[PDB]
Design a protein around this ligand. Structure first.
Ligand SMILES: Nc1nc2c(ncn2[C@@H]2O[C@H](COP(=O)(O)OP(=O)(O)O)[C@@H](O)[C@H]2O)c(=O)[nH]1
Lengths: 31, 441, 224
């Protein structure tokens, strides 16, 4: 197989959602 | 934060009535002092307080004083509108007169009756909530400008040393009378330069060039263009009147507009409208000198400071793209690393964006090097005639009356002060002017 | 209920929506004691500021219930200290601990959750502190250009350069940077969220969607 990365937008979107959730969860865990 | 406007002669009062009318319309507050808004609501999204006093009966008058040496001009405004002015706060000259369109004339009225003009000003300040800096409009060379406007700045500096003095300067003589008015301009500038904190210049050419393109009567020059200029001078308070957050006061704006106060005069740029579109283009459209208020041949000037407020159907993505010409087109402030500042929105709700409108309008102002073209006109004119003996010896009133020695010295020293302003516009654009400031430190 | 007016008031309170004169009004007088709290103990006279605020609440609009319900509390932990619990925010490796909150009635509390209030509280504290410092710099500019000692003449070029021009050059750079940040935060962050919420009131069909956007915007602001 070709040693290639999956698509970039999806990688960034996942990072954005994880970052948003990381933030939200910093608060959800107590609130 | 209350503002009181001081209106000098025909300049101040005609533009004033056109402005108060434009504001009467923008706030639906009424040209007769009666709110034009329905009584269906007790809540508002604007702030008329700083410019208009609300009475116990919900009636309104502007926070302004009309200047005393020209009672026929005061009457023009007070009688035409009347219900939207408060004459009881208006000072009228103690002798009912104006001894010529000159510095000596109004200066002498002012120095002789400084206490009386101040008593009217001071008493109105006591009736308001936290007075914010003084707003003055005048013809720099005229009897009410070079004369009384100059005296007001001196009077205000001593009576109100803790307040900001901001003025509006309009273009000097437009005709051969410049061989006289240029002397008045220079004495006036000495006082404007030494006493004001900030100001701006409005060139006749733009009033007329705009007139030629906007009115269907292209023969209009200073009258009627006063309404065009009053829509230009609206951008100054919109962020206060239709409050925003970013730049909501005088002290919060002047530190951004002119960090180095000696170069106190801004160069406005504005797209006129009746009373095109995109944030991208309205911003870019104002970089074009034809929309400037001090138009000249310097299509490649340097800048010390650029600021712009866009009001309307604003699109921040377009603003971001417009920024490309900040980077490509503004000769950099190699001496200070300044950058352009902006503010947005707050269209009057009573003059809303219309259906299918994506238009915006706004004001760009800048502290530009190449603005000498609206000052040198006097500096390099009155002096060649002055050197042959002053041509204003028929205005020997007050200080010019006391001695011919004062006449020649006031004119010469004022020219040197003005020359410093010209020297500062030029010195300021040199990198060497400020590089040594931090290197030798 | 007129939820639109209520949320507009909430935005007026915490996002500074069309509140430039209110933030400056808040700073007026209060800056005098605000500078002392990080230069004092937890026994500091917080009550003086609280009274100034109470007095402002007395001089208030009868319909703006959201302001009537607004209160100030003090923490001992300043923004960077309280914010140390956020995974994306790094701690120092402390100036203001002033915080605002609101007591919300159940018809609204179900919308205005504690999570959103916390996000509103922390966002406003950021906005207030930045405005505070921006204002000190602006008043400093006016002091510079008013005070006779700053308008000296005939001493030397060495001092005109090293004291006056040097002050103005540094001041202007400080001003350009702090103001540009504020402009960004409002123009490209807060305005978008207020705008988005207005879009969501265009004959909305779902209560939840509105609730999700309220939270959405608060996160979009916090993760900037
Ligand atoms: N832009 C503008 N300039 C004016 C107006 N009236 C007079 N001027 C200019 O002001 C200067 C003369 O001042 P003026 O106000 O007429 O004399 P004053 O009454 O003694 O102050 C000249 O430069 C005129 O071109 C006006 O309504 N608009």
């Amino acid at each position: 197989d070709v040693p290639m990365s999956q698509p970039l937008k999806e990688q960034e979107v996942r990072e954005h959602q994880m970052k948003k959730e990381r933030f939200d969860r910093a608060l959800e865990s107590k609130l | 934060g209350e503002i009181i406007t001081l209106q000098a002669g025909q300049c101040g009062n005609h533009v004033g009535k056109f402005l108060w009318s434009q504001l009467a319309k923008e706030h639906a507050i009424g040209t007769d002092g009666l709110s034009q808004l329905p009584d269906s609501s007790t809540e508002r999204d604007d702030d008329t307080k700083p410019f208009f006093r609300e009475n116990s009966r919900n009636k309104f008058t502007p926070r302004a004083i009309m200047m005393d040496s020209e009672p026929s001009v005061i009457a023009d405004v007070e009688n035409t509108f009347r219900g939207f002015f408060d004459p009881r706060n208006t000072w009228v000259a103690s002798d009912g007169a104006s001894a010529g369109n000159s510095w000596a004339n109004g200066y002498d009225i002012g120095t002789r009756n400084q206490d009386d003009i101040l008593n009217k000003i001071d008493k109105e300040i006591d009736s308001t909530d936290n007075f914010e800096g003084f707003q003055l409009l005048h013809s720099v060379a005229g009897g009410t400008g070079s004369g009384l406007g100059s005296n007001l700045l001196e009077a205000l500096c001593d009576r109100y040393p803790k307040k900001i003095l901001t003025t509006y300067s309009v273009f000097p003589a437009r005709s051969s009378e410049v061989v006289v008015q240029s002397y008045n301009t220079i004495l006036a500038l000495r006082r404007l330069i030494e006493d004001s904190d900030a100001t701006v210049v409005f060139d006749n050419a733009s009033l007329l060039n705009i007139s030629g393109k906007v009115f269907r009567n292209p023969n209009i020059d200073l009258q009627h263009t006063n309404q065009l200029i009053s829509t230009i001078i609206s951008s100054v308070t919109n962020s206060i009147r239709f409050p925003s957050y970013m730049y909501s006061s005088m002290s919060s704006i002047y530190s951004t507009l002119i960090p180095s106060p000696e170069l106190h005069f801004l160069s406005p740029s504005f797209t006129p409208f009746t009373s095109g579109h995109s944030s991208y283009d309205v911003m870019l459209d104002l970089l074009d000198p034809s929309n400037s208020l001090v138009s000249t041949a310097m299509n490649n000037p340097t800048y010390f400071n650029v600021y712009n407020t866009i009001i309307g159907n604003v699109e921040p993505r377009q603003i971001s793209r417009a920024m490309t010409k900040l980077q490509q087109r503004i000769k950099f402030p190699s001496w200070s690393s300044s950058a352009m500042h902006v503010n947005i929105g707050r269209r009057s709700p009573y003059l809303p964006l219309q259906p299918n409108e994506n238009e915006v309008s706004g004001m760009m102002l800048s502290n530009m090097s190449t603005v000498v073209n609206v000052f040198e006109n006097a500096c390099n004119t009155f002096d060649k005639v002055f050197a042959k003996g002053a041509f204003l010896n028929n205005y020997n009133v007050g200080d010019l009356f006391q001695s011919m020695q004062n006449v020649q010295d006031e004119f010469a020293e004022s020219r040197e002060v003005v020359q410093s302003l010209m020297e500062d516009y030029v010195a300021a654009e040199q990198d060497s002017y400020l590089d040594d400031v931090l290197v030798d430190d | 209920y007129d939820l639109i007016n209520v949320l507009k008031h909430l935005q007026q309170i915490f996002l500074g929506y069309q509140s430039g004169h209110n933030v400056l009004k808040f700073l007026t007088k209060n800056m005098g004691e605000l500078t002392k709290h990080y230069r004092n103990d937890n026994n500091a006279n917080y009550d003086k500021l609280l009274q100034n605020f109470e007095l402002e609440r007395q001089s208030e609009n009868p319909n703006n219930l959201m302001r009537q319900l607004l209160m100030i509390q003090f923490d001992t932990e300043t923004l960077p200290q309280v914010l140390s619990h956020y995974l994306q925010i790094y701690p120092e490796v402390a100036i203001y601990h002033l915080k605002f909150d609101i007591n919300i009635p159940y018809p609204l509390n179900i919308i205005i959750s504690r999570t959103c209030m916390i996000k509103y509280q922390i966002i406003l504290r950021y906005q207030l502190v930045l405005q505070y410092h921006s204002r000190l710099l602006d008043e400093t500019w006016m002091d510079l250009n008013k005070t006779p000692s700053w308008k000296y003449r005939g001493y030397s070029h060495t001092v005109k350069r090293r004291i006056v021009r040097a002050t103005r050059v540094l001041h202007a750079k400080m001003n350009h940077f702090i103001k540009t940040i504020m402009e960004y935060f409002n123009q490209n962050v807060i305005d978008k969220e207020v705008y988005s919420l207005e879009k969501c009131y265009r004959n909305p069909t779902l209560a939840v969607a509105i609730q999700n956007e309220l939270e959405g915007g608060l996160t979009n602001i916090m993760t900037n």
